[PDB]
C-alpha cells in the first residue's frame with residue numbers, strides 16, 4: 001500500500017506491432033559560441049585576405 | 050590512510066571578508082575599454 005516498484009522493462013518482441021517496436025533514439029546536443037568549436041565538417045579552408 | 054593526526058586540534062569556523070575576490074572574465078568573449 002502506497003509502495004510501488006518503479007523499475008520496469010519495455011516488452012520487446014520481433015512480432016509486436018510498430019507501436020511496441022523499439023526505436024533507438026540518439027539526441028544530438030550542442031553548445032553555441034561557448035568555446036572554440038573542435039567539431040566541423042570537411043569544408044576546406046581558404047586563404048586569408 | 051585513515052590515520053588521525055595526533056597534535057591536530059579543531060578550530061571553530063571563523064569567518065573572513067574579501068575585497069575584490071570573486072571577479073573573473075565570464076567567458077572567452079573579449080572586451081576592452083568598455084563597461085559591460
Ligand SMILES: *[C@@H]1O[C@H](CO)[C@@H](O)[C@H](O)[C@H]1NC(C)=O
Pocket residue numbers: 051052053054
Ligand atoms: C579519526 O578518529 C575518528 C574518531 O574515532 C574516526 O571516526 C575517524 O575515522 C578517524 N580517522 C580520521 C583521519 O578521521
